[PDB]
Structure formats: C-alpha cells, structure tokens
Amino acid sequence: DKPIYTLQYGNVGFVVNPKTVNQNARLLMGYEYFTSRTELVN
Amino acid sequence: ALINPQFPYAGPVPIPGPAPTETMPLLNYRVEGRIAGIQQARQFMPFLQGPHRAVAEQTYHAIGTGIQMGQTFNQPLINTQEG
C-alpha cells in the first residue's frame, strides 16, 4: 500500500539484529518492485 | 498495419542494407529479321469451296413417238324412243 521509495540511495534499510551468528552466515534478500523508464510515446 | 509503443516498428529499413549486385542491366536487343523464301501461288486440297448435294432430286429426259391408228367395234342400231 505504501511502497518503500527513497529518492536517495539508502535512506531506507531492512534491518536484522542477530542473536547468534554461525560461520558463513548471510541474508538472502528477495524484492518485488515497480520502476519506470525514461519516456512513453503515443 | 499496427504500430505499438513502446515497441515501435523501425521507422524504415535503414542504411545497413547490403547492395548485392550492379546487375541491373538489360542490354537492348538489336536485330534484323528476314523471312523470304519464294512463295508459289497454289496449295493442293481434297476439296475446297464445294457445297455437296445431300440428296438430289429425281431428274429425267423425255420422248414420245408414234402414230394414230385403231381397230374399232360399234354398238348396234336401236329403235329411237321419243322425239
């Protein structure tokens, strides 16, 4: 309903504060988004 | 034709085309033609121009001849009735 849209790179971030971190830990992110383009012609 | 935006149909076949040949020329034909064999005035056919009879009429010639000759026998005389 209110998509994350920064104008600035990084104004907004997704946060995870881990309790325990094993060797080779990582976050695999997945995103759904809308984005244009430069022009539209009729 | 349909054009669809944003995928538009190129506005031409452009300048990247490969001219493949200069063979474009039809060489004009120049010629002198003579058909001159002696002609003889006649042809032979089985029949030309006839309107053959499908049936003829009957046809004839004529003759007569003779004389006037005769042998005769007559009725007898009778009594006359009246008058």
Side-chain angles (χ1 to χ4, degrees), chain A residues 37 39-41, chain B residues 5-8:
Chain A
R37 296 179 175 180
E39 291 180 19
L40 292 63
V41 49
Chain B
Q6 307 177 25
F7 294 83

Side-chain angles (χ1 to χ4, degrees), chain A residues 15-26:
Chain A
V15 186
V16 170
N17 184 300
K19 190 184 301 291
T20 72
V21 182
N22 301 321
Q23 297 289 68
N24 298 314
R26 55 180 179 168

Side-chain angles (χ1 to χ4, degrees), chain B residues 12 19 26 37 41 45 47 68 70:
Chain B
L26 290 64
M45 285 175 180
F47 300 83
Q68 299 180 25

Side-chain angles (χ1 to χ4, degrees), chain B residues 2-83:
Chain B
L2 300 61
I3 301 174
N4 293 3
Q6 307 177 25
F7 294 83
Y9 294 96
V13 44
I15 308 172
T21 305
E22 289 178 19
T23 305
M24 289 174 180
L26 290 64
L27 294 64
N28 290 3
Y29 295 96
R30 292 181 175 180
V31 52
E32 289 181 19
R34 296 179 175 180
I35 298 176
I38 299 175
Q39 301 180 25
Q40 303 180 25
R42 296 180 175 180
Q43 299 181 25
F44 297 84
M45 285 175 180
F47 300 83
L48 294 63
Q49 308 175 25
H52 298 283
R53 296 180 175 180
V55 48
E57 286 181 19
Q58 298 181 25
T59 306
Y60 299 95
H61 293 284
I63 303 174
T65 314
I67 303 172
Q68 299 180 25
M69 286 174 180
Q71 294 182 25
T72 306
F73 290 86
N74 290 3
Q75 297 181 25
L77 298 62
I78 301 174
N79 291 4
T80 306
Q81 303 179 25
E82 290 180 19

